[PDB]
Amino acid sequence: MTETYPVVKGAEPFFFEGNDIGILVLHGFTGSPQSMRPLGEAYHEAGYTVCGPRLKGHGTHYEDMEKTTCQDWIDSVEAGYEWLKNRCGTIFVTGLSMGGTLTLYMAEHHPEICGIAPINAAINMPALAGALAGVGDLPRFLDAIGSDIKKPGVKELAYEKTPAASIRQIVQLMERVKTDLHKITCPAILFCSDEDHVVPPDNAPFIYDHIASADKKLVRLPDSYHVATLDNDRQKIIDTSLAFFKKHADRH
């Protein structure tokens, strides 16, 4: 596909020059880099080189999104990875929701990745998969309202509709990332909201159980809902991820 709409203000990808340690920061499904930008600025302020990419058909119009595949989303992630690889010998990947899924995908295909930090990563979503047995009975565009965030008054740049055709794209990505988890050896910290109205809570331990990593931990986000990067536990995510980055950078 090709995007007919322009990037919405605030949805731009961020590229931060820094030292030889890079961080790849990924947003989720119908989202944009706006939800990841606070993490990205924080990691940049710590001296790190940072890339938050814009996934294709994201941050423009959901009509654009409708035409994208999950391979398009991977391409967008891989392009950001490659940008980092030209500037950095050490690269970590972190992402929210489907960005966490893509974070796991990257660890599944690129052994040189030093560590990962998915946030509320989705590998199993019965509701969506259920909607697929249907899908001819679904509206072309589902109303997607609003963002799942506990902290009141918070606004996320994300689409107000989900294309029904994008559902099979995210399901196909989750299925593929699910079966491939055993391939992951790198250090992993899995952030999981206590209450998440979007991704089932059993996703986090499931991921924990099927990756082959020797150094792995689940980290609870007790005051936050699904979009945790804009939520109460935002700082906890940042501080924990910085400590994680430093720790493994020091040990290589």
Catalytic residue numbers read 97, 196, 226
What's the CA gap between 52 and 161, in Å, rounded?
23
Residue 24, CA atoms < 13 Å, CB-side half-sphere = 33
Identify whether the C-beta of residue 85 lies closer than 8 Å to the C-beta of residue 162. Answer: no
* Neighbouring-strand partners of residue 93: 24, 116
Under DSSP, the state recorded for 183 is: G
CB under 8 Å to 38, separation ≥6 — which residues?
229, 230, 234, 238
Identify whether the C-beta of residue 216 lies closer than 8 Å to the C-beta of residue 208. Answer: yes
Structural element, H or E, at residue 96: strand 90-96
Two structure tokens written together for 115: 């560590």
Tell me how crowded residue 176 is: count the other CB atoms within 10 A of its CB.
15
In one letter, which amino acid is 151? Answer: K
What's the CA gap between 211 and 202, in Å, rounded?
15
CB under 8 Å to 201, separation ≥6 — which residues?
192, 194
